[PDB]
C-alpha cells in the first residue's frame, strides 16, 4: 500500500538531493575505488540506498528516515579530510538538509 | 651481479607486493601534485629504488632501508591523516618493516 507519509518522504528525499549538484551523495561510495572505506565507516549510506529503503517500506516513521540522512553527512565528515570538496559538501548538506527536514517532520507528525 | 644485489631485488619485489594499490610504484605525479616538492625534500618510490638498485647505488642494506623509510615518511608528511595515501603508508610501515627485518639478517652474512 502507498501512503501519504511515503509520498511525503519521496518528496523530502528529492528536496535533500537538490542541494547536491555534484551528486556526491547519490550512490554508495564505490568500494572498488575506495578500498579503505569500510575500515573507517561502519554503516555506509547514500541517497539511492535511502530510496531503495523508502520504496521497500523500511521508513515507517520520520526518525528512521532522518537517521539515515544524518549518516550520509556524518560518514562523509568522518572519512574525508577537512580540507576537501567532500568534507565541505557534507558541512553544506548538514546546513541545507537540516532545514528541509524541519518542515517535513512538522507535516509528518500530523499523520 | 652479486648475491647482495639479487637479495635486494627479491626484497624490493616483496615490498611492492605489500602495496596492493600501487600507490608507491612510481614518483608522486608532480603534474597532479604541484606543491609536492615545496614540502618533500627527497621524493622516493619503488621505481626509483629499482633504478638505484640496478645502477649499483645500494652499497649496503642501510642505504636501501633508508630509501624505503623515505617512501613512508614522505607520504605521512605530505598527506592529511584521513587520506587513502596516508593510511596506506601507515600499513606499509608495518608490513614493509617486517620484510626488511628478514632481509637484513641475510644481508649481514654477506
Amino acid at each position: 500500500q502507498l501512503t501519504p507519509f511515503l509520498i511525503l518522504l519521496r518528496k523530502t528525499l528529492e528536496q535533500l538531493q537538490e542541494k547536491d549538484t555534484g551528486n556526491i551523495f547519490s550512490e554508495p561510495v564505490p568500494l572498488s575505488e575506495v578500498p579503505d572505506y569500510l575500515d573507517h565507516i561502519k554503516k555506509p549510506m547514500d541517497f539511492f540506498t535511502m530510496k531503495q529503503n523508502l520504496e521497500a517500506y523500511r521508513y515507517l516513521n520520520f526518525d528512521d528516515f532522518e537517521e539515515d540522512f544524518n549518516l550520509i553527512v556524518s560518514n562523509c565528515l568522518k572519512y574525508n579530510a577537512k580540507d576537501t570538496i567532500f568534507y565541505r559538501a557534507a558541512v553544506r548538506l548538514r546546513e541545507q538538509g537540516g532545514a528541509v527536514l524541519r518542515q517535513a517532520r512538522r507535516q509528518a507528525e500530523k499523520m | 651481479l652479486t648475491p647482495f644485489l639479487i637479495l635486494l631485488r627479491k626484497t624490493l619485489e616483496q615490498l611492492q607486493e605489500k602495496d596492493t594499490g600501487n600507490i608507491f610504484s612510481e614518483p608522486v605525479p608532480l603534474s597532479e601534485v604541484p606543491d609536492y616538492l615545496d614540502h618533500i625534500k627527497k621524493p622516493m618510490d619503488f621505481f626509483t629504488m629499482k633504478q638505484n638498485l640496478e645502477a649499483y647505488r645500494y652499497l649496503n642494506f642501510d642505504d636501501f632501508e633508508e630509501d624505503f623509510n623515505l617512501i613512508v615518511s614522505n607520504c605521512l608528511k605530505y598527506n592529511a591523516k584521513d587520506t587513502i595515501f596516508y593510511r596506506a603508508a601507515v600499513r606499509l610501515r608495518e608490513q614493509g618493516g617486517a620484510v626488511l627485518r628478514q632481509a637484513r639478517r641475510q644481508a649481514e652474512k654477506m
Binding site: 564505490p30 575505488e33 575506495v34 570538496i85 | 600507490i23 615545496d38 598527506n79 592529511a80 595515501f85
Partner: peptide, 10 residues
C-alpha cells in the same frame, strides 16, 4: 601537509 592530492580513494 601540502595542498593534497584530492580525490576520493583511487
Amino acid at each position: 601537509s601540502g595542498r593534497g592530492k584530492g580525490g576520493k580513494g583511487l
